[PDB]
């Protein structure tokens, strides 16, 4: 059934304060190992 009348983006009515950061915490496992500069910080 083709519909061009209803706004399908109703999910952002259900976003809380920590939604972005919990999505980041969920995506923390799918990611490649970060590159390293060879030192702990530019002050090390």
């Amino acid at each position: 059934p083709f519909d061009n009348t209803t706004y399908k983006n109703l999910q952002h009515h259900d976003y809380s304060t920590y939604t972005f950061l919990d999505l980041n915490l969920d995506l923390s496992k799918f990611r490649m190992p970060q590159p390293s500069s060879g030192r702990e910080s530019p002050r090390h």
Binding site: S37, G38, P42, R43
Partner: protein, 85 residues
């Protein structure tokens, strides 16, 4: 750096004392304000030797050239990153 361009001949400082009436800097050195301008070191040395002034010479201290890189402020692995800008 326009005051580093020429050589200067001055003399040793002598005693400046307090005027008893006003507290002014009394001097007895006639050569306390004598500063001579020379283009090269050798002209000043020749003028000192011509007048019988015993002299000491300090060599011209130019700053050595630097290595400046604006991208060095934002390096990947070097300590030369700026922590802020």
């Amino acid at each position: 750096v326009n005051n580093t361009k020429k050589w200067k001949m001055e003399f040793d400082t002598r005693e400046r004392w307090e005027n008893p009436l006003m507290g002014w800097a009394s001097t007895a050195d006639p050569l306390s304000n004598l500063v001579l301008t020379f283009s090269t070191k050798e002209d000043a040395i020749a003028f000192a030797e011509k007048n019988g002034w015993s002299y000491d010479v300090e060599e011209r201290k130019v700053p050595k050239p630097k290595s400046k890189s604006y991208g060095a402020n934002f390096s990947w692995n070097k300590r030369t990153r700026v922590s802020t800008k």
